[PDB]
Every structure is written in structure tokens, then in C-alpha cells.
Amino acid sequence: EFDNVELKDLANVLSFGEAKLGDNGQKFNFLFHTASSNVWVPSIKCTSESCESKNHYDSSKSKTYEKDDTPVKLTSKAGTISGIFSKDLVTIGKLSVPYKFIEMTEIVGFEPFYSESDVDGVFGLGWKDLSIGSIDPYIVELKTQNKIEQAVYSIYLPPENKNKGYLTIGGIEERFFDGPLNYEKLNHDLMWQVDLDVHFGNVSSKKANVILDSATSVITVPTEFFNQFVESASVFKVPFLSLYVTTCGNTKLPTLEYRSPNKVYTLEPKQYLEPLENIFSALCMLNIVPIDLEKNTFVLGDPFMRKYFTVYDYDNHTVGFALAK
Amino acid sequence: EFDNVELKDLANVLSFGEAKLGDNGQKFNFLFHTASSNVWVPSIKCTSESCESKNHYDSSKSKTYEKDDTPVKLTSKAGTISGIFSKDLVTIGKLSVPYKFIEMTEIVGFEPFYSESDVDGVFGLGWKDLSIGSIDPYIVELKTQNKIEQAVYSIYLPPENKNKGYLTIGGIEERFFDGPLNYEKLNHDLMWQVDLDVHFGNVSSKKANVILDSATSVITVPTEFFNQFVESASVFKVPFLSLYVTTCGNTKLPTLEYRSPNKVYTLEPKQYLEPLENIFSALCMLNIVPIDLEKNTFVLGDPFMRKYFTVYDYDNHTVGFALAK
Ligand SMILES: [Zn+2]
Ligand SMILES: [Zn+2]
Ligand SMILES: [Zn+2]
Ligand SMILES: [Zn+2]
Ligand SMILES: [Zn+2]
Ligand SMILES: [Zn+2]
Numbered sequence: 001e002f003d004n005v006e007l008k009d010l011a012n013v014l015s016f017g018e019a020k021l022g023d024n025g026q027k028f029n030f031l032f033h034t035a036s037s038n039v040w041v042p043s044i045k046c047t048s049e050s051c052e053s054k055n056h057y058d059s060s061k062s063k064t065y066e067k068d069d070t071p072v073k074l075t076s077k078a079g080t081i082s083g084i085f086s087k088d089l090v091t092i093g094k095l096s097v098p099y100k101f102i103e104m105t106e107i108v109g110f111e112p113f114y115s116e117s118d119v120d121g122v123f124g125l126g127w128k129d130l131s132i133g134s135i136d137p138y139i140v141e142l143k144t145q146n147k148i149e150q151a152v153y154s155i156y157l158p159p160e161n162k163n164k165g166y167l168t169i170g171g172i173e174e175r176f177f178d179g180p181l182n183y184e185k186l187n188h189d190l191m192w193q194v195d196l197d198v199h200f201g202n203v204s205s206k207k208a209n210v211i212l213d214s215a216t217s218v219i220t221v222p223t224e225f226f227n228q229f230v231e232s233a234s235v236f237k238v239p240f241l242s243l244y245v246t247t248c249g250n251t252k253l254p255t256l257e258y259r260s261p262n263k264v265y266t267l268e269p270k271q272y273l274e275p276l277e278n279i280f281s282a283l284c285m286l287n288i289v290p291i292d293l294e295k296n297t298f299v300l301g302d303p304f305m306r307k308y309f310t311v312y313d314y315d316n317h318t319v320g321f322a323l324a325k
Numbered sequence: 326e327f328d329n330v331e332l333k334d335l336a337n338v339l340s341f342g343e344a345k346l347g348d349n350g351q352k353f354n355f356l357f358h359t360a361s362s363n364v365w366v367p368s369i370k371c372t373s374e375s376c377e378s379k380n381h382y383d384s385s386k387s388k389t390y391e392k393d394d395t396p397v398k399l400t401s402k403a404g405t406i407s408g409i410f411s412k413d414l415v416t417i418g419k420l421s422v423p424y425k426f427i428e429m430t431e432i433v434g435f436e437p438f439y440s441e442s443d444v445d446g447v448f449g450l451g452w453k454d455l456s457i458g459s460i461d462p463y464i465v466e467l468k469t470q471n472k473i474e475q476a477v478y479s480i481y482l483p484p485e486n487k488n489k490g491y492l493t494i495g496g497i498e499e500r501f502f503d504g505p506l507n508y509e510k511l512n513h514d515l516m517w518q519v520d521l522d523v524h525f526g527n528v529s530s531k532k533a534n535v536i537l538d539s540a541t542s543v544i545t546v547p548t549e550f551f552n553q554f555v556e557s558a559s560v561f562k563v564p565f566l567s568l569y570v571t572t573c574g575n576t577k578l579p580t581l582e583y584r585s586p587n588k589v590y591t592l593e594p595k596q597y598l599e600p601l602e603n604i605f606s607a608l609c610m611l612n613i614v615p616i617d618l619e620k621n622t623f624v625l626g627d628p629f630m631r632k633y634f635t636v637y638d639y640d641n642h643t644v645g646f647a648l649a650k
Binding site for chain 2: 010011012013016031076077078079081109110112113114115116117118119121122160161162215216218223226241242243244245247248249270274275276277278279280281282283285289290291292
């Protein structure tokens with residue numbers, strides 16, 4: 001019975017969708033992001049070159065708008081973004097609640113990928129403690145105002161990368177997975193992150209912090225971890241043509257295991273290799289990028305999510321996993 | 326006027342499209358491949374697992390069919406594909422012509438990517454000397470049965486990965502590009518390859534063999550060359566976090582320059598950087614990959630073709646370039 005919005009592919013990442021703001025259901029294309037905690041839309045007031053082609057929010061055209069206007073500034077190396085807090089009806093699907101978001105006023109940097117893109121802004125589905133201004137998560141607010149029974153959502157990406165993906169709010173659709181769904185405890189309520197013991201052949205990392213991130217097409221691993229593997233690889237004749245390039249038929253590659261106390265999650269080469277050409281390619285690239293984000297931290301993006309249906313439960317502070325069907 | 330087939334996105338590669346086979350115009354999804362010289366389609370007589378949701382070719386239901394049945398088999402490390410030669414009407418757009426091609430009977434390996442893919446086979450568009458069975462290129466054959474004036478084709482990918490792209494046959498639509506187009510002579514009539522002098526900051530490789538390949542989303546570079554480049558990147562503090570990862574706001578990276586006797590073609594960081602996430606991404610990947618394919622050989626994939634509208638002229642043994650607009 002639940003609420004399902006369709007997700008679309010943009011750059012090997014399938015978590016883009018439509019959501020509406022205000023009385024007059026103004027439309028935007030959002031990147032639905034499990035690892036951030038605000039919603040961002042371009043304001044009509046946006047003076048910047050990148051805002052041109054975008055959908056705009058116009059508070060004057062919506063009767064439900066509630067002036068807030070608290071200024072916001074997020075400076076990063078890739079660019080900067082300023083804007084204001086506004087309140088209004090925010091709608092995904094047949095679900096609609098009054099909600100505080102950020103109208104983007106100016107946007108320097110982040111070029112050219114922002115203007116080159118068909119996506120207007122980001123719709124965070126992370127946790128409160130991470131959000132600018134301590135705003136309750138959107139799904140929690142739906143629950144607070146009895147629009148849905150449980151503060152849960154799920155992400156289904158299809159295993160053969162052709163069909164439609166779904167973001168579902170309010171309960172669990174049995175039709176997305178086979179087998180039992182297993183729950184893991186959130187280690188802390190910042191992001192959607194769990195303690196797992198990560199193994200990749202001979203290398204391992206006990207008590208790793210594993211972050212789910214819908215918005216990346218990549219699997220990440222700390223530098224030291226990847227160095228360890230390169231060492232195991234160098235020794236016993238694991239044949240590479242460059243650091244990240246190998247044959248698509250490479251039997252001798254190890255399986256990435258993420259082990260909880262109750263369940264093992266795996267990515268076989270078949271899942272962490274992208275081919276250099278669509279079909280009939282001799283050559284394949286490791287879709288694993290080594291990056292030090294934070295001590296002992298690993299990220300799971302789409303390759304993991306193309307295999308595992310995932311459930312995000314605020315009520316219970318848990319993430320659920322199961323094989324997608 | 327000239328005949329135009331639309332191209333669709335799959336995995337950052339925009340060279341997939343529609344071609345018909347035979348009397349009853351059986352539809353397929355082809356990877357139009359400029360670096361191979363046969364057309365391959367899955368036969369109805371195809372046993373294998375991966376063939377199963379693929380659009381098939383059926384001899385018997387096409388009266389223009391002309392048996393050949395010559396045994397063909399290609400193995401690579403990625404897998405095996407065998408089939409038989411067959412000849413029949415091969416149509417793209419309005420242009421139509423009897424062409425010898427390959428029906429794939431068995432196909433081992435090339436998984437999962439083949440069966441996960443919505444494309445059926447590869448429509449070669451290279452040269453005769455590279456094809457199996459010494460077959461005249463398709464567009465050459467179009468000229469041979471006086472279906473087109475000139476045995477030229479062109480590929481347009483749009484500068485902003487927004488709109489659609491086109492494979493245009495027999496002519497040069499000038500709405501696609503700006504400035505003159507600049508022709509380069511083929512070093513060898515095998516692939517569409519040219520002699521260029523490659524520069525990347527302080528590293529260069531004179532008289533490099535440079536291949537144009539529509540099927541790769543990547544720029545490729547000899548292992549040595551990339552090594553020099555990273556060594557260069559060492560000495561004058563270019564801020565790398567890992568070996569292919571840097572900030573998206575890093576302007577201190579060199580332009581990549583492909584210099585011919587008459588013209589210099591360039592890729593800016595703007596063009597060889599791909600962000601880790603689709604919008605507002607702090608980090609970026611080097612879309613340049615090292616691989617020794619052959620002496621001093623460099624491959625130009627989609628990152629290049631998105632900036633350069635390209636023209637492939639059999640009549641003249643040349644490749645032409647101009648800024649896509
Ligand atoms: Zn402007
Ligand atoms: Zn906390
Ligand atoms: Zn362990
Ligand atoms: Zn993210
Ligand atoms: Zn030079
Ligand atoms: Zn190719």
C-alpha cells in the first residue's frame with residue numbers, strides 16, 4: 001500500500017527523483033541523499049549562472065509558505081552555497097507535510113557538473129545531528145504528523161541495471177527481496193553507518209565504520225587497507241595491467257566481505273568491476289577507490305545497493321539488508 | 326537532409342542506437358563501434374543463457390536472407406563467441422543494403438555485463454583490413470550500391486550531457502559544429518588512428534599513435550606516460566589524495582594537448598574530471614586510465630568526443646574534428 005517514488009539513472013548513480021514544494025506543487029529533480037540532512041532547492045532569488053536552467057522555488061506563488069529567512073552558509077573547497085531557511089509543504093508521492101528547507105540564493109563553484117546536470121537540488125534522508133539547524137528528518141516529520149505509521153524508508157535498485165528503482169516510505173515491500181532481511185544496529189545516529197568487520201582476501205579491518213551512501217557509484221576503502229591488498233596482490237601473482245586495471249575474466253580476485261555478528265554481506269568481482277566498454281570488453285576497472293574519509297571508514301554506494309535492498313529505520317535505529325530480486 | 330540515427334546513454338557512453346535486420350525489419354540495439362569491423366547479432370539458434378532476453382535474428386522469417394554458414398569463432402580472455410556468417414538487408418534510418426554479418430550461436434563469458442545490458446550486439450564501423458572474412462565496411466557498401474554520395478559518417482555527442490547525440494551518414498551537417506573542421510591523415514587504414522604529439526604538462530610523447538573509440542567513457546594513456554605525469558605531479562605539488570582522486574575545484578592541473586602538424590586539440594580538467602557524486606561533490610576522479618595496448622598508443626573516448634564533433638571519411642582516409650556546439 002505504501003508510497004513509492006521512481007528513481008532514475010544520471011551517471012551510474014540511481015537515486016534521483018521528483019519531489020514537490022508548496023501549495024502549487026512546484027516540481028524539482030532531487031538527488032536523494034542518505035548521507036546528508038537538509039533539503040536544498042534553487043530559489044527564484046538565485047542570482048547565479050548555474051541556477052539558470054534549474055527549476056526554481058517561488059514562495060510568493062504558494063499560500064502555505066511560512067517566512068523564516070534565517071541565513072545559511074556552507075563553504076567547501078569545491079565551491080560555496082548560501083541561501084535561507086523557508087518553511088512549506090514538501091511532497092514526495094501522495095505524502096505531504098510542512099517542512100523547513102533551504103532556498104539556494106547564491107552558488108559559487110561546483111562547476112561545471114551542476115549546470116551540466118538535470119538535477120535541481122539535494123533531498124537529504126540522513127539524521128538530525130548532521131543537519132544545519134537541527135531539523136528533524138523529513139520521514140520522522142511525516143511520522144510525527146501521522147501521515148505514516150513507521151519512520152522507515154527503503155531503497156531498491158534493480159540487480160540488472162535497466163529497469164526502475166524505488167524509494168519507498170512507511171513500511172517494507174516484500175516484493176523487493178528474497179530471503180530474510182537482516183538488521184544491523186546504527187553505531188551512532190550521525191549517518192546511516194554500522195560496525196562491520198571488513199575482509200578482502202588476506203586483509204581485514206575489525207570494527208570498521210561502514211557508511212551507506214546512495215549518491216555514489218563507488219565503493220571506498222581506507223588507503224592503508226588498499227595498500228595492504230596491493231601488498232597481498234604483489235606477492236602471490238595477482239595480475240594487474242595498471243593499479244586499477246585488470247581482465248574482466250580475472251578469476252583470482254578476492255571477494256569483499258562485510259561481516260556483522262549475524263550476517264556476511266559480499267561483493268564479488270562481478271560486482272566491484274566496471275568494464276571499459278559496455279559489452280564484450282576485454283578490460284575492466286576496479287570500482288574501488290581508496291580514500292581516508294574518517295578513521296576506519298568505508299563507504300557503500302550503488303554497487304553494494306544494486307545487490308542489496310536496504311531499509312532505513314529511524315524508530316529502531318537500524319539498517320536492514322537483503323538480497324534484491 | 327542526411328540520414329540521422331539517435332544515440333542513447335548507457336554507462337557514460339553515448340553510442341548505442343537502433344538498426345534493423347532483413348525483410349521484416351527486426352529491431353536490435355547496437356553499440357556502434359568505430360574500432361571494430363563486423364556486425365554481430367544474437368541468433369534465434371543461440372543456446373546460451375545471456376542470449377535470452379536479447380532481441381534475436383531469425384533467418385527463416387526474412388526472405389532476403391542469403392545463407393553463408395561459414396564457421397566463425399573468436400576467443401578472448403573475457404570469453405568466447407562463435408557463430409556463422411549470414412547476409413541480409415541491414416538498415417539504419419532510411420538507408421538500406423545487403424550486408425554480410427555474424428549470427429552469434431554460442432557465447433561464453435562476457436558476464437554479467439552482456440546479459441545485464443539492454444544492447445544486443447555491436448555494429449562495427451572500422452576498416453576492412455580489421456574485419457574477419459575481409460568484408461567492406463557498411464558505409465563503404467552504402468556508397469558501392471550508390472545509396473550515398475560520400476562514404477563519410479559523423480558522431481555528435483552534445484557538449485552538455487543533456488540532449489541526444491547523432492550518428493549521421495553520408496554527409497556533414499554543419500549545425501553540429503563551430504569553426505572549421507580540421508582533417509588528419511590516417512597513419513594506417515585499420516582503425517581510425519592518427520599520429521599526434523601528446524603533451525600533458527611537462528610530459529610528452531612525440532608521434533604517438535592515437536585511436537578514436539566511441540565505446541569507451543575513458544581517456545587512455547601508456548603506463549610510462551601516466552607514470553611520468555604522476556612523477557611530474559609529485560615534484561611541483563599537485564594535491565593528490567589518492568592516485569586518481571583530487572578536489573573538484575583544483576585549477577592547478579595541466580591541459581591535455583594532442584598536437585598535429587596543423588591543429589592542437591585539448592582537454593581541460595573541466596573535461597577529464599568526473600565527480601564522485603553527481604552534484605555538490607567535493608572530490609573528483611581522473612578519467613584518464615593507463616594501459617599499454619600497443620607501442621605509444623593512446624585512446625580517445627567519450628570525454629574527447631563530447632568536446633569534439635568527429636567525422637570519419639573512408640573516401641579520403643581521414644578523420645575530421647571541430648568543436649561540437
Ligand atoms: Zn548566464
Ligand atoms: Zn549523536
Ligand atoms: Zn575478521
Ligand atoms: Zn554522499
Ligand atoms: Zn611536442
Ligand atoms: Zn572499442
